Write a protein that binds this ligand. Structure first.
Ligand SMILES: [Ca+2]
Ligand SMILES: [Ca+2]
Ligand SMILES: [Ca+2]
Ligand SMILES: [Ca+2]
Lengths: 144, 188, 468, 416, 48, 48, 51, 36, 35, 48
DNA sequence: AGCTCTAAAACGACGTCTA
DNA sequence: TAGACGTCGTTTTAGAGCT
RNA sequence: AUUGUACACGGCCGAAU
DNA sequence: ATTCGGCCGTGTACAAT
């Protein structure tokens, strides 16, 4: 709910326009115009009510509580896929779904370091599962 | 997407007459095969024969080669077809009116279907529950289990893993387990 | 920097789907949320004959209607419609024949003759409670009993000629009687009568206008009768949530500190259950916080009460406390949630002593519902200038509430502030909707006053009708 | 030939100008056609927060003018005579009707309810140039006419564009450098008397857990006997000030308060039993006055009365909080009472309760601005303007940006 | 009896079988040709 | 191209309304209203 | 807005406008048929937001 | 005292009728304001 | 229903332009609801 | 060189690789976890 | 029985008497 | 100096008029 | 104690010296 | 002793600028 609220505000912020990061190079680092004459997409990026699904703190703690990184990634993919399934079959079906990963989830899935003793860091193995690649593969059947 | 099959294509695909000798009698069903093979597409599809959008069209029956099929009146066909088109577009047409003081319930229907080999029996399940607010969810899933046989009933482990899956699907929308779970089955 | 927000006033429900932002106005248009069966609410009265007759005419006086005490502000000081088609409760309040118990002058003089105030209070409580039993067992069978204390008793029981509180003691000692009670002073039902204050004997007790008094008193009588007047209007698609307010009250000796909890959740359908309860097992101490073991038991009891009405565990649990949430309480609460499989949980400390405030140009304070985010800590103005009332109904300056959520909170402070602001409008003890504290937090403190005199281990009714 | 005289186009110019004013306010205007009977338009109220049309209407009559002076104009107020036939028609209306006067010369618009007769003269209206201006600031006043104040249950959502409010917080610009050391002294209180004998008293130092910390270097402008010189190694403030340890929060807060006391020692005295900063009174029975900006405002910081009397020093409870790894200062206005101005008064109950009861948001906000001005100025550069014996203050205070509120209090409509 | 009115495949409400039972059979026809272990959408719009 | 054009006309034909197939039982065989205020779905079925 | 026009009363005899307003919303249909329309009566369903 | 004579009402009615005829035809009609 | 701030902005601009034309000396006739 | 400016994943047009080469590598990351013989959508919006 | 000015209504400000 | 009363500008149709 | 706020007073608790 | 945090309890004034 922190990330969902944070990302929703960011979409509204882009509607009001964002100043250029580097005024010296105004072409390489332009400013987002936002709503108005120069709206790049001529559309409003809104998050309709009921189109948001919240990852509970217990759900995040469930993923972070798994020792093996590969098992944690697979468990997280099944968790997000279930939430994705509920979002696409609901009344408010979105056009595109944004997964605003919380900081603890990124730390566990990408950086692969656990708050407790880390198991899969100790046993590196042949390779490591990539959460982003697995999530996209496991949601190819979903229409959004 | 509406698939308006032409009359000559219907004759070959359904009536199979244009027929070769019968080999077992388990002829493929074009509609079911088409729906399955395009399950990865993001848009639902609808099959419409010409005789429904045109009262002049006539497709003869498969075995009774001398008689055309009898269809409902044009107004009734428009009612059923457009309602299905609206539902497949991504919106629920109507819902049961809920009693104010009712237990939060989830309905789980269990059925079986013959395997393509004609002998084994699989389990197919559907789940109905109303989401938070004005909505109704109808899920269709197959029990992710490997216990193959000819029994038109589930096993102890198979049913447990099936009910757990249905509860998790309900918990995805409501964030709480249902107060009541009604399981309807086609066999004892 | 700090981002502000001004929540619109939450909408209420007054039966038949009636929606309004004002309880008293909403009751006028649509009536109570739960319609009373029958047409008469039988009210029992106990007191001296002048007090009984004085209050009996007051109920009839409400039927004819009470003119608005301040024509300038008729939204803040409205008239009482009376027994017409705009009756706020769609029912009439009567003192039926045989539902009257009279305190004799000898009985009153018996109480005032005791030198010790505490001994007199205990003697008065056992006398009044005995008269309560006679009214309940009799053929009268009222729905709510009103105790109209005479002036000499008030001068003795309240004023002198720590110490026991008569109302708290009386409520506790009558917790075993089915009919709820309601103490009413003669100032409420008669403008002529004046009660001197305790410390300053010269000053009288300033009271609201009679129209406002009739609104608040009869609303409490209707709620204590057994029907919920109004309820927060539920959203279209919101999580099934349970609110648990945790408070602490001083022990009778004045040193030790107990835990008193109040829980509010929506009933299946049109209803709002408010349960006042005490921690089943309390560890002796002066701590204004909880222990991991007892905090677990409070949640477990809270879930069971919710599950008794809904047959499903709540989707979201919001816990409001009068003290900062510490690690012991948070991990104790988390243990209970894992047992019941509650998905989301909030842990908010409702601080009232924060010095942070907000000021605007002009002679009136900021609007009610104005919220400002402070590094994840919310500054909610539950009290302030009300556009509906046309003024700010209060003293010098409203003090905002500082909401400090624990790190183990699923929802954002923006969402929690909206829920906390909404919870201030379901305090049925009054019809004015600009309450500073949320109902679960306030009800917990009000429950603690009565439970101060109830001995530990005694089984008492969890209904909030007996404590409000 | 056909002519459109300047009077006709000016009359249509006023109607368009008022429509432009109404539209930018947020309402909806409704120009009436050829069959208008005395109302030049209809105004429909809109909710600026949600955009929903409120459905409450009110008639508008616009009387323009290229140039000139109204009746009895005195650069403060003027009068306007209503035509009796117009007045009779407006009375029969079931909606309120307001007359708007537009002048082209100074492009100003004034409005007044046609029922707002003055001195009992029904067909005379008395405008006020300071409060009858037609513009978005008066949106709440216009909508208030659409309901009968005598019936219960009628109200309007706030219609103003918005307001701006102060936060009652002062951002603290800590020096990037903090002086820390492991002083041999065990406790802070033990080292206080030892400082007096050595001399060079500064008192911006806090030592606890046998560790010393200050914003100033102890080797000069202060004593050295309390600390061991070798271990005094200066380190950046970000290491301890914004450090998560609870003990590092307590000493920083104590160090901040003691540092603040010296900066405002010229005008502020810090009471100890109650953690209260109050204006020190120069002269036993001489009232003071402190000037602060907003504009020139002089508030009686020290006030005395007759009889046995008292001195009401303006007081505050300065407290420090850490938000988003940035330190802020909280101002809590209060009052302090003293008999002769130096020793505390003994029964400030009736004085405090009597004084605190009277003031409102306007007065309380003024005290916050006064204190904010004082602390900001007390840490400004060149406050001593000597570069010796009076170094630049360590703490810099700057006002937070004004808080933006979407809704505004309809204070103007609440006139009784 | 109430479940028979939410089939959504027809506008005539005198349906013999309850929707969960009927919907299960409709899913079965499509899934005979879907090989086991293949993830498919659970939306009923793809089977009705 | 015959069926695509044929079905497209049918979708527009339902917009104009279809007379009931049996007036004796107007509830069992009702007439499709069309695009008026009685539009069953409050939307237009068009082929872009 | 909610309404589509305003009707203002006027005395047919003297022509004096009474000043009483009356909101009007107009729904226009083309060869439609209202819900349950007999030869003597029919019905109409108001949108909830209009109410 | 305010009067709206039948002449003005008749003229407005004629303008409205002509606008209705034009809209029945299928064109667009714009009515000019006071400064016509 | 609702009236968006962009919807009232368009009417504000047309009213502002009509105001600009009037003291220029010309005549302005705002068109009807049809675009 | 022209094919380097149709990489819709970014708005910075100077890209080192043509889109068909770039897109073929992106789908490789996703299809790495897809079992062979499983029909998947060919739309590139699912892989970018 | 045609024209043509002439009445009759409304709105839009603006000198001019009329005190 | 205020303050109706007036002249001036338009639409709008309809009448008494000279013909 | 119809109703709560504001203020005043008093008691007490948690962490480290 | 301090420095930081906080809490609960009993009274008066007032009905809101
Ligand atoms: Ca009460
Ligand atoms: Ca006009
Ligand atoms: Ca179908
Ligand atoms: Ca991408």
């Amino acid at each position: 709910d922190d990330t969902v609220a944070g990302f929703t505000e960011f979409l509204a912020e882009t509607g009001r326009g964002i100043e250029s990061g580097n005024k010296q190079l105004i072409n390489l680092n332009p400013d987002f115009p936002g709503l108005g004459n120069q709206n790049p997409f001529r559309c409003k990026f809104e998050v309709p009510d009921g189109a948001t699904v919240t990852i509970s703190r217990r759900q995040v703690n469930d993923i972070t509580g798994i020792g093996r990184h590969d098992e944690a990634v697979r468990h997280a993919v099944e968790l997000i896929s279930s939430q994705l399934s509920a979002l696409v079959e609901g009344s408010a079906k979105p056009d595109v779904i944004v997964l605003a990963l919380p900081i603890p989830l990124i730390e566990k899935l990408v950086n692969a370091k656990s708050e407790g003793e880390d198991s899969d860091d100790d046993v590196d193995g042949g390779d490591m599962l990539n959460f982003r690649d697995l999530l996209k593969a496991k949601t190819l059947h979903l229409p959004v | 997407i509406v698939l308006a099959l032409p009359i000559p294509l219907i004759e070959k695909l359904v009536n199979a007459k244009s027929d070769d000798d019968v080999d077992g009698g388990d002829m493929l069903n074009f509609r079911d095969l088409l729906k399955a093979k395009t399950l990865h597409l993001p848009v639902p599809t609808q099959i419409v024969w010409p005789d429904t959008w045109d009262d002049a069209a006539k497709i003869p029956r498969k075995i009774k080669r001398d008689s055309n099929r009898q269809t409902q009146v044009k107004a009734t066909r428009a009612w059923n077809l457009l309602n299905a088109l609206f539902y497949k577009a991504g919106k629920v047409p109507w819902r049961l009116l809920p009693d104010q003081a009712e237990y939060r319930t989830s309905f789980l229907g269990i059925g079986f279907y013959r395997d393509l080999d004609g002998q084994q029996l699989w389990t197919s399940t559907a789940q109905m529950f109303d989401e938070r607010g004005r909505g109704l969810i109808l899920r269709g899933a197959r029990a992710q289990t490997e216990t193959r046989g000819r029994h038109p009933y589930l096993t102890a482990k198979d049913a447990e893993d099936l009910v757990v899956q249905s509860i998790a699907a309900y918990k995805a929308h409501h964030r709480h387990v249902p107060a009541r779970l009604v399981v309807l089955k086609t066999s004892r | 920097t700090f981002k502000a927000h001004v929540f619109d006033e939450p909408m209420l429900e007054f039966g038949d789907g009636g929606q309004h932002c004002d309880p008293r106005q909403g009751l006028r248009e649509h009536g109570p949320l739960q319609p009373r069966s029958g047409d008469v609410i039988r009210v029992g009265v106990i007191g001296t004959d002048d007090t009984v007759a004085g209050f009996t005419e007051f109920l009839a006086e409400t039927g004819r209607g009470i003119e608005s005490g301040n024509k300038q502000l008729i939204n803040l000081n409205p008239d009482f419609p009376g027994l017409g088609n705009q009756n706020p409760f769609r029912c009439k309040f009567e003192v039926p024949d045989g539902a009257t118990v009279t305190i004799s002058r000898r009985q009153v003089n018996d109480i005032t003759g005791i030198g010790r105030h505490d001994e007199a209070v205990r003697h008065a409580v056992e006398l009044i409670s005995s008269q309560l039993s006679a009214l309940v067992e009799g053929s009268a069978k009222p729905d709510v009993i009103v105790l109209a204390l005479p002036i000499p008793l008030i001068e003795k029981l309240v004023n002198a000629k720590d110490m026991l509180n008569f109302r708290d003691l009386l409520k506790a000692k009558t917790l075993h009687l089915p009919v709820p009670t309601q103490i009413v002073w003669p100032d409420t039902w008669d403008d002529a009568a004046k009660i001197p204050r305790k410390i300053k004997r010269d000053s009288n007790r300033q009271t609201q206008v009679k129209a406002t008094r009739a609104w608040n008193l009869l609303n409490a009588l209707f709620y204590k009768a057994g029907k919920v007047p109004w309820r927060l209007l539920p959203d279209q698609a919101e999580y099934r949530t349970s609110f648990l307010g945790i408070g602490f009250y001083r022990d009778l000796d004045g040193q030790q500190l107990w835990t008193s909890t109040a829980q509010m959740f929506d009933e299946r359908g049109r209803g709002l259950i408010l349960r006042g309860a005490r921690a089943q097992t309390e560890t002796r101490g002066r701590h204004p916080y909880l222990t991991a073991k007892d905090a677990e038991d409070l949640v477990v009891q809270s879930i069971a009460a919710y599950k008794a009405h809904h047959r499903h565990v709540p989707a979201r649990l919001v816990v409001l406390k009068t003290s900062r949430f510490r690690s012991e309480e948070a991990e104790g609460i988390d243990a209970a949630l894992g047992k019941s499989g509650i998905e989301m949980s909030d842990l908010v400390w409702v601080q009232e002593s924060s010095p942070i405030a907000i000021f605007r140009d002009g002679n009136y304070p900021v609007l009610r519902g104005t919220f400002v985010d402070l590094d994840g800590k919310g500054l909610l103005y539950t009290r302030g200038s009300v556009p509906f009332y046309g003024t700010f109904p209060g003293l010098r300056v409203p003090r905002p509430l500082l909401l400090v959520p624990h790190e183990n909170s699923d929802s954002t402070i923006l969402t929690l502030a909206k829920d906390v602001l909404a919870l201030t409008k379901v305090n049925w003890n009054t019809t004015q909707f600009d309450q500073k504290l949320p109902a679960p937090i306030k009800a917990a403190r009000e429950v603690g006053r009565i439970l101060k005199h109830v001995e530990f281990g005694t089984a008492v009714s969890s209904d909030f009708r007996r404590y409000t | 030939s056909k002519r459109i005289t300047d009077s006709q186009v000016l009359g249509e110019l006023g109607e368009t100008a008022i429509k432009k004013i109404v539209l930018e306010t947020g309402f909806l205007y409704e120009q009436r056609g050829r069959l208008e009977a005395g109302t030049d338009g209809i105004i429909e109220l809109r909710d600026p927060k949600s955009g929903a049309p409120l459905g409450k209407l009110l008639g508008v009559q616009v009387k323009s003018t290229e140039s000139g002076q109204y009746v009895r104009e005195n650069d403060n107020s003027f009068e306007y005579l209503l035509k009796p036939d117009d007045l009779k028609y407006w009375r029969t209306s079931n909606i309120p009707v307001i007359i708007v006067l537009w002048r082209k010369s100074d492009e100003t618009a004034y409005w007044k309810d046609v029922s707002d007769c003055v001195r009992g003269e029904e067909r005379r209206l008395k405008f006020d140039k300071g409060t009858d201006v037609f513009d978005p600031r008066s949106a709440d006043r216009i909508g208030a006419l659409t309901i009968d104040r005598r019936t219960p249950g009628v109200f309007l959502p706030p219609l103003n564009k918005g307001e701006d409010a102060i936060i009652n917080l002062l951002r603290i610009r800590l020096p990037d450098e903090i002086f820390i050391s492991t002083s041999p002294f065990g406790s802070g209180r033990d080292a206080v008397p030892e400082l007096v004998k050595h001399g060079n008293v500064r008192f911006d130092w806090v030592i606890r857990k046998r560790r010393f910390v200050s914003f100033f270097d102890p080797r000069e402008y202060g004593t050295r006997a309390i600390v061991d010189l070798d271990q005094v190694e200066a380190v950046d403030t970000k290491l301890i000030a914004f450090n998560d340890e609870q003990d590092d929060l307590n000493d920083t807060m104590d160090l901040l308060r003691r540092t603040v006391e010296r900066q405002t020692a010229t005008q502020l005295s810090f009471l100890r039993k109650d953690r209260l900063f109050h204006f020190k009174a120069v002269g036993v029975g001489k009232s003071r006055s402190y000037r602060y900006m907003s504009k020139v405002v002089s508030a009686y910081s020290s006030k005395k009365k007759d009889g046995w009397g008292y001195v009401r020093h303006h007081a505050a409870r300065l407290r420090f909080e850490r938000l988003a790894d940035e330190w802020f200062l909280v101002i809590d206005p209060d009052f302090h009472f003293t008999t002769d101005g130096f020793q505390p008064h003994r029964y400030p109950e009736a004085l405090l309760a009597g004084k605190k009861r009277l003031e409102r948001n306007a007065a309380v906000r003024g005290q916050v601005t006064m204190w904010q001005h004082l602390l900001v100025e007390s840490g400004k550069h060149e406050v001593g303007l000597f570069d010796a014996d009076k170094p630049a203050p360590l703490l810099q205070f700057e006002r937070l940006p004004v808080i933006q509120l979407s809704q505004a209090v309809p204070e103007s409509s609440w006139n009784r």
